[PDB]
Design a protein around this ligand. Structure first.
Ligand SMILES: *[C@@H]1O[C@H](CO)[C@@H](O[C@@H]2O[C@H](CO)[C@@H](O)[C@H](O)[C@H]2NC(C)=O)[C@H](O)[C@H]1NC(C)=O
Ligand SMILES: *[C@@H]1O[C@H](CO)[C@@H](O[C@@H]2O[C@H](CO)[C@@H](O)[C@H](O)[C@H]2NC(C)=O)[C@H](O)[C@H]1NC(C)=O
Ligand SMILES: *[C@@H]1O[C@H](CO)[C@@H](O[C@@H]2O[C@H](CO)[C@@H](O)[C@H](O)[C@H]2NC(C)=O)[C@H](O)[C@H]1NC(C)=O
Ligand code: 7S1
Ligand code: 7S1
Ligand code: 7S1
Lengths: 307, 307, 307
């Protein structure tokens, strides 16, 4: 009888059933900090090309969208594209053996053009299907072995989170320093390399193909006057698949007119997209809850006494 | 007495009250696949114009923002706009009868310019209020009868969802094939026409004015060791109003300098915006929950025996 | 005994425990309305400059991302930037006393360039560290005293919210008029000045540095056939910090080629970002819930009779 009561009180205190539970409504704002300089040479379209320059903050990041920001880590540039007819890039399914090899008015899913039914020569007696689209088509090329945005990990991000709860009627807002698991857990500025070290994923390896990382924030807050604890817990987990179109990459174009001719530049962007997740639990003691718990435990105690 | 107990156990098993319930934290990544070629001629500004060309993946879509992507289906192009003074486009409230007809320093909500108080001639003794803004103003014109992006329905979208739960400490990640309601429900690649066929909304009709469609995912997962079921359920529903500024459309500009003169191109974009929604329910059996349910049913059984 | 029963029924009716509770899944679409004309003169780079013109809808706003839109209120323009070497802008940590004062191959966090280790003269015997990046670097300059987008408050925004619930199997969709707290609470068109008047924050003061505002919507809906109440409640709260890199601002660039030379224009954007939040509570009466509540109150009544 007494043991059932002590265990009921201990379980109720451990689960905190007397305090009312409610979700948290958060609004996040992020500011990217740090710049990187790319000075690597990679051949393009059969010709060796040298790339050099520095990327400002606005060059490698977008504004926060849906409580999540993106950061570039690698890219493939294609300049001078203009609508027209050209032979498709050589692929396992793009090479044509004869003129009538390909089908007219057909567009493959992987191909970025609609075939006109003509077998043309891309380079030196190598025939692919004549396609109608942005010419020339971007070459199928793996991400560069060294991630162009090598200095991306040394970057530091600033995350400001505003918490609001309807029942509480309060809003909680979350020196230059880098967040550390134990030394400095309060610093809201994070080093990407520190995050990937938290998740155990190589930043240099992921930056080549791209990735999707998210920052999880847990709130174990209780509105009780006695034990008032409300501190943001920072947990990190990788959303990308790892094993592996893996990583994060999309086609982004910039259109310009040259010599009275419409032109477009297609850029394949590989990067890491961070999703800021805010999950919290609020608990403001309510008399009805305590009365319900007591009412439920009373029967258990009585049955324990009956045996 | 016995019937009340059997009904209590049957109801508890049907509602699954013994298993702990928790929400699901998801992160979605989408990749658009497919291209369309537009070769339609539509008159513009009183002159017949011919439009032809193919649109790549980067041309008709944006990067995923807020777990939702947008896909263009129709557009109205306006080129050569530059700041200055010009007569407003003829409308029910823009035509001026006399010079002093319009008010100086006034800007109507529907109008995109601030009137200077001068009644000018747009074309052939037709007078509208002189306005200061991007000139010339884009003409009020209905969406083209045939949706320019006819081939949009044949497109295929790839959706990858990563599920994470705090109490479970696990992450679940969700061949070229098209998803089917019964034949192939596992294929994560979707044909837009298949979605609109699921919702029963004509794609060709909606593409003209634009629309907002969302993909709902339901999770009826249970963490119990006995019955372990965790499969993503795909439900589809149209968020747009249908009846009807209906549809989805926004003004998107691209600024270029020509002949040492600042210029801007205004494009009215009509398209369908897909919102990926992830709703799930987790249930990991907890002793406290079962004890609470039993404690609540005990009183009901006793009262049933008392009668 | 009787008082405990009457109080139990009154408390159950007040808390509405018999009705099933469920969250709400919303999809929001926003359309910005109104235009502003900027005709202010502010000196730039030691030279007085005059700015004049009108901004269309597409100029000061982006498409809705993550159920939240952004509206510009102030900006700093920097034109002609091109990659190269140049002296950094004079700052407390950028001025070099001697040639060997600065460290080679070092980039400060606040600085947007990587120092080459050379002490150069920015203007008249004033030495800063030679940096490699976008040249010339944007000058450190406070936001203009008068917010360039003065007419932003007079703007009107249209918000359309679609509500969906899985258990209810229904979708609820939410004349030109401005929403008022009491006169016209149904008008879905909002005047920004009206919002900031609701939150008590000066719009003219915030527009200079920028801000983050959110529109909260509460749903106290009950699916009971007797008392069927389901009306959207509009509550407003400011997410920005106020006290204070405060406000909302980001670097946004536009790249153009001039005289066969790659060039970029960096624009520091200050604005207010509105986050549309949808929180609701659904309640469809369930027999199991009522039976549970009654079972929990029965023990309390019996104990009250025992005394
Ligand atoms: C990130 O910062 C670290 C220093 O905190 C850099 O490490 C140095 O790298 C240089 C070569 O660039 C070496 O000469 C130094 O010996 C390194 N020092 C340390 C302590 O590691 C690192 O190179 C930076 N990474 C990037 C991509 O810029
Ligand atoms: C989408 O694909 C279907 C085929 O799966 C196309 O249907 C064909 O259309 C052509 C005309 O372009 C007809 O000659 C064929 O007879 C059609 N076949 C079938 C099976 O429908 C359809 O035209 C495509 N739609 C778009 C907009 O490209
Ligand atoms: C917003 O609209 C109000 C009117 O509703 C404007 O107020 C007028 O401002 C002009 C000067 O531009 C004065 O001559 C009038 O006397 C004002 N009238 C009233 C009733 O206030 C206000 O200027 C507008 N604000 C902006 C930034 O355009
Ligand atoms: C804003 C844009 N950044 C861009 N940065 C470059 C600046 C100079 C030269 C470049 N060359 C190749 C590639 C990039 C650049 N260029 C564009 N557009 C971007 C960033 C992240 C993801 C997509 C797009
Ligand atoms: C990225 C952009 N796509 C664009 N595609 C075109 C490419 C060539 C010619 C065009 N002509 C008219 C209209 C479009 C185009 N042009 C721009 N900007 C876009 C896509 C979807 C929604 C808004 C904006
Ligand atoms: C789309 C863009 N608006 C822009 N509007 C201008 C139009 C003409 C002259 C300008 N001069 C200075 C500054 C702006 C402008 N220009 C660009 N890019 C924008 C809007 C809001 C936030 C970021 C970016």
């Amino acid at each position: 009888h007494a043991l059932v009561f002590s265990y009921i009180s201990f379980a109720l205190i451990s689960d905190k059933r007397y305090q009312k539970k409610e979700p948290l409504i958060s609004s996040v704002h992020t500011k990217v900090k740090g710049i990187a300089e790319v000075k690597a040479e990679i051949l393009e379209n059969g010709m060796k090309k040298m790339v050099s320059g520095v990327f400002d903050t606005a060059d490698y990041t977008f504004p926060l969208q849906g409580n999540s920001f993106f950061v570039m880590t690698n890219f493939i540039k294609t300049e001078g594209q203009q609508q027209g007819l050209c032979p498709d890039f050589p692929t396992a399914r793009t090479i044509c053996s004869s003129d009538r090899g390909c089908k007219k008015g057909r567009m493959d899913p992987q191909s970025k053009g609609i075939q006109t039914g003509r077998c043309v020569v891309y380079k030196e007696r190598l025939k692919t299907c004549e396609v109608s689209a942005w010419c020339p088509i971007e070459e199928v090329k793996d991400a560069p072995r060294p991630a162009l945005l090598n200095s991306a990990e040394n970057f530091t991000v600033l995350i400001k989170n505003n918490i609001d709860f309807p029942g509480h009627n309060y809003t909680t807002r979350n020196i230059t320093c880098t967040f550390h698991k134990t030394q400095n857990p309060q610093c809201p500025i994070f080093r990407l390399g520190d995050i990937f070290q938290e998740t155990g994923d190589s930043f240099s390896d992921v930056a080549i193909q791209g990735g999707i990382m998210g920052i999880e924030i847990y709130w174990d807050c209780n509105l009780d006057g006695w034990f008032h604890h409300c501190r943001p817990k920072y947990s990190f987990r990788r959303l990308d698949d790892k094993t592996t179109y893996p990583g994060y990459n999309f086609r982004y174009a910039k259109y310009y007119k040259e010599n009275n001719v419409e032109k477009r530049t297609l850029i394949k962007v590989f990067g890491i997209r961070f999703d800021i997740l805010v999950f919290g639990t609020g608990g403001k003691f309510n008399v009805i809850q305590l009365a319900v718990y007591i009412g439920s435990v009373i029967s258990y105690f009585g049955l324990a006494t009956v045996f």
